[PDB]
Write a structure and sequence with these properties.
- This is part of a larger assembly, with chains A (207 residues), B (120 residues), C (113 residues), D (118 residues) and E (53 residues).
- In chain A, 9% of the residues lie in helices and 34% in strands.
- Chain A has 207 residues and is mainly beta.
- Chain B has a 5-stranded mixed barrel with strand order 1-2-3-4-7. In chain B, strands 5-6 form a two-stranded antiparallel ribbon.
- In chain B, a hairpin with a 5-residue loop joins strand 1 and strand 2.
- Chain B has a single domain, classed as Ribosomal protein L14/L23 (Ribosomal Protein L14, Beta Barrel), CATH 2.40.150.
- Chain B has 120 residues and is mostly beta strands.
- Chain D is built from 4 helices and 3 strands; from the N terminus they run H-E-H-H-H-E-E.
- Chains in contact: A-B, A-C, B-C, D-E.
- The interface between B and C is medium-sized, with 19 and 16 residues.
- Strand 6 of chain B pairs antiparallel with strand 4 of chain C.
- The structure holds 5 RNA strands.
- Chain B: Part of the 50S ribosomal subunit. Forms a cluster with proteins L3 and L19. In the 70S ribosome, L14 and L19 interact and together make contacts with the 16S rRNA in bridges B5 and B8.
- Chain B: Keywords: Ribonucleoprotein, Ribosomal protein, RNA-binding, rRNA-binding.
Amino acid sequence: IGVVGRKCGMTRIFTEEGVSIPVTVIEVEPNRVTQFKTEETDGYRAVQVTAGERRASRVTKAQAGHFAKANVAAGRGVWEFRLGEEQYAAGDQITVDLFQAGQMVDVTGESKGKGFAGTIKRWNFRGQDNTHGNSVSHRVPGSIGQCQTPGRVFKGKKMSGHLGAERVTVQSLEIVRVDAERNLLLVKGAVPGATGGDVIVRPAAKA
Amino acid sequence: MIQTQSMLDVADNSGARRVMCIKVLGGSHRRYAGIGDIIKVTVKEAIPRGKVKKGQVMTAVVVRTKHGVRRTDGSIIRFDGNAAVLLNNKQEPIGTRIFGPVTRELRTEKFMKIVSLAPE
Amino acid sequence: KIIQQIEAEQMNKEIPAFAPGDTVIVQVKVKEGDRQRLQAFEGVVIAKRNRGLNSAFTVRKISNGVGVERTFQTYSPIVDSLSVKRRGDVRKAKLYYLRALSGKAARIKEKLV
Amino acid sequence: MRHRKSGRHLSRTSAHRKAMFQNMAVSLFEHELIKTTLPKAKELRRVAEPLITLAKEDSVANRRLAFDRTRSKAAVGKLFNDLGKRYANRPGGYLRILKCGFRAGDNAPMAYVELVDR
Amino acid sequence: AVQQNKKSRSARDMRRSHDALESNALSVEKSTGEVHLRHHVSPDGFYRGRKVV
RNA sequence: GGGGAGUGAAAUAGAACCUGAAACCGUAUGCGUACAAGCAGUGGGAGCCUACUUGUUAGGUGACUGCGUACCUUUUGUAU
RNA sequence: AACCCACUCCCGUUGAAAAGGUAGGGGAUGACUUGUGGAUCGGAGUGAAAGGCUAAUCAAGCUCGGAGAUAGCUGGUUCUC
RNA sequence: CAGGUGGUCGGGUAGAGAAUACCAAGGCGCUUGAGAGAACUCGGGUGAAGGAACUAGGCAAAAUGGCACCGUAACUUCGG
RNA sequence: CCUUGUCGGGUAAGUUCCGACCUGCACGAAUGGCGUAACGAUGGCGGCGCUGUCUCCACCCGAGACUCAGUGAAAUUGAA
RNA sequence: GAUGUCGGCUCAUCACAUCCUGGGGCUGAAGCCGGUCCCAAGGGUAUGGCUGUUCGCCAUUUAAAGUGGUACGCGAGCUGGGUUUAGAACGUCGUGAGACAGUUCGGUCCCUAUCUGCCGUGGACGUUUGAGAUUUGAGAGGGGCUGCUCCUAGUACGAGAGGACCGGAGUGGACGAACCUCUGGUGUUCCGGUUGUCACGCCAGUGGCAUUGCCGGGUAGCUAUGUUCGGAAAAGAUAACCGCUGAAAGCAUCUAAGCGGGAAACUUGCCUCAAGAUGAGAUCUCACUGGGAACUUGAUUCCCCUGAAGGGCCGUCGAAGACUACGACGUUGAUAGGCUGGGUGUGUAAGCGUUGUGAGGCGUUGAGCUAACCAGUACUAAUGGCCCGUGAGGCUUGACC
């Protein structure tokens, strides 16, 4: 179980003893249960949620009927949460209330798309020398493989292209503040993605 | 100081005037050493009679960097000049007298003698 | 409009009006050895960020013959209070040229009187 | 990577852009309808419209702040006397961009850019 | 860096199995009744029920 | 540059002009091709499509399947 | 500085260029640089000498002949049983 | 065709200058353009903290840069 | 040659450098022997300054790359 | 009818004959240390001075600075210092041209990738009517390192000297991922100062050109050197090793039956991709409920009507991007630009007054200007256009109708 919110940028909190703790603030408009997938009817236990406000003209008839079984009147995206043993009816509303402070949590978003990186930026390679006789290749990868054994490049060779919008989980981030009146998690540190990207906050896998 | 071959001043009374870091002690290849870290120096320039002579491989604590040390709120102290305090084998400072300020990050279990002598 | 309110609830007052070029005395908090006390830090304000809660100011002091710049965080509770000692004429916002001037060359003029 | 980076390079130095854009501003303030490439039309609207907003207020400081960035006497006179009394009650959007086919020699997507009450 | 074998008809044509064309964004003015590109001024200078040039 | 009309026995003899091959490039029709590994064939072989007139035929494709490393020249020897 | 040169890097190497460009570099009133005209030529010139140069050619130019040189070498040698 | 090709003239302001910079008279926009703003590549700009640890080698770069005055070592063929 | 000979200096560390030693494989007096101020786009060592050479690269600016329109090569190639 | 060296750089990949870290046995192992031999390949595994060096010798580190295969890996990836063509010189050999178990200075590194490979990213078709979304996980990849001070405890042990394992934190290093709140870097799209000159008739003001002329700063964005997080714990089946019970072989024996413990190895656990997994899976929801003719009756073909759900073209764009794709929006609209406020940066504009002989000060005035930022606002531009996609989804067999 977890929650779906959007990243509102990073801020800071000073404690009274004087340490500034770096804080990202994950705004969680309250998530609305659409299905409850049971192992009898679906093979596994899970719950679908929704987070608010799509236009009427952007919700298709299949999608509107799915959002009208569950009397939810629902919004951008649909997300899923594998469950162990929890019971949610298909109209319920899970909020930031499933988090306390302290409360180590795992946060996943989509990382910021760097476009088509080179091997220095993508895989932290070394550059060759810039001046000592070096011909045209100052920033290129070096050799790829070995000569005639094997006579081909091994799979998974580190080359260049698209440091992009992959899914990244950042795990064991402490919850600084659960602010349920205006629906906020304040989370210690960095979180993957830009401001306003969708971000999934569920408790820590390494506890 | 922060790197092998960094030249840095000496905040001691009867030793060197310039040392050069030849190694950053600690890990396998530590490339950097800030305030409170332990470098090993060679003495490049010294006074005519004193406890330390020119070209003597010695250990030193870095007390004063111009990259600076950073506090728990994001405040940096940032000196104007790199300086070290030389040390003996059982790492106690050689000089009986310490010049210029040190910072608060240095009063550990081992360098209380430096902060006690400093005019911070 | 959300993170501009997380910020504003922490910015209760600490601060006078000070400019680059001023000489201030900052009263900072220290705690080691089981005590709470104030240590002064007097010098020339050379820089100012004005980023709301993320505001900072650099201040240059020449103590025991060596320079030291401290970039304070303005709304941190370590900066307990602030007081402008004398205030100066600089017609700049960032006085970094004072890092090369040494003695009488690094003196800030008083037209602002 | 140009994340959130406005402006476009148009295969030019910055001084070349500044000359070309205040040329297009002056030519549009005299003719009130010119014909240009669609990206240069998209970037003209960020140069030319603050000049009309500036021209909605007669000051000496406004007419030589207009003059140092549209540097022709005729366009400072066309502003502050014609364009700026006309556009005095319109909150922005003093010019529109209408796509008009493609250039014959290139395929440069063309656009007309037109002052709105012409 | 050259080929060691000339390429056949078949692989030459399979390469260019992708470079066929489209431009179907045409539409008709309700006023004049002529075809023009979408979101573009007409070749007789009209645009959304109004002459503009 | 053509589409006609005329001339001519003939213009797919129209001036780059008799004939007008092959390489190479197209359009049309039939059949086969998007879970299948290699000298591209060959032996087996279903299906489909055309002409016939029907059948124990003729033409065209050839799913699937057994075997299968071009030609030359040089060599003791070459898929090499 | 012009002019003459060509020490270094980088580019260029299917070049803009069959020897260059851009940054820097050497000489720059002389044993200097250069125009125009003339002289020296193939075991023969000229050479502050390197086998340098002699029309993008040089341990003996180019062209035409002897000439279809010679090749114990290489390559090739065409329808059928 | 970024090359080569003898001689003549030569304005303003700054400048020793025919260097150089902005200009006059005069000439020109170098015969593919439009977008876009990845890797990489080229020609540049700035760069925290170190300051030759780079490398075969300070290669490249960075630096120094003028005029007036003061001052200026070894050595020397008495000119440097 | 042995050889990075040995000793001194320079460096934290020096097969290079400078000063000696003399066991000169294999110096030596116009194929000149020893010195030598000044002069080298000369060889080798060290230093100050100086810095993207480097740790370790980040960003930016133009020119290609990429897409669109027009024109339109090449080396190679038994068939695939 | 050419397979271009040694070394360095850049990038690797495997083995295990294991350098560290992990698990053991024996000991001439009291403890800190060791010696040797098994088991283990998961992750790690110096920077430099010299020399062209590989190596080596030193200097200083580290937990450790492993040994090898890969054309002594790697020049259609770089270098070109050594060897090394043409120049010259030394010593030596030769009458000589010249030569070298030799030294020495100098000396051109070409290729736009067709195919396989590899890293990315799409277009087609197929998944059995089609569609919008959400998914399970067969499989695959990533990850896996380690030091120190302390806490029982100066205890167990040891005459003493000395010194623990085993119990658990908290602070580093190297590496990796994300991020930009902070610290800074950049910021030729912002604001100033300034030199030379030219111009806008001129004074003022300002603008071109001088590398952004030079420079001071600096928004957003990107960013490391900045910030945060990570390696786990746990489980299982084991490797040596340690066994219980236990015969064959009245005993003894880990074993032959049968039961256990046991490591960073292996399978999970952690993160990411993943139904082209042709074995193409599963959920929830939506859409289509018209005739006729020919010939051959899974029935196909043709005509008329009808084209839905939705998808696309197109447009405004994006913290998404080479082109794509992805994502958002398209007047029932904040998608971009402008506008209106704020903010941030710069640093007291112009004009006028005032003082001065003038340069220049003082006011007005933290003024003027202000990019990418924040909030609001339909002023401009996103056109109630077209195209695809159809008309209830074969047959056999079984069970319940």
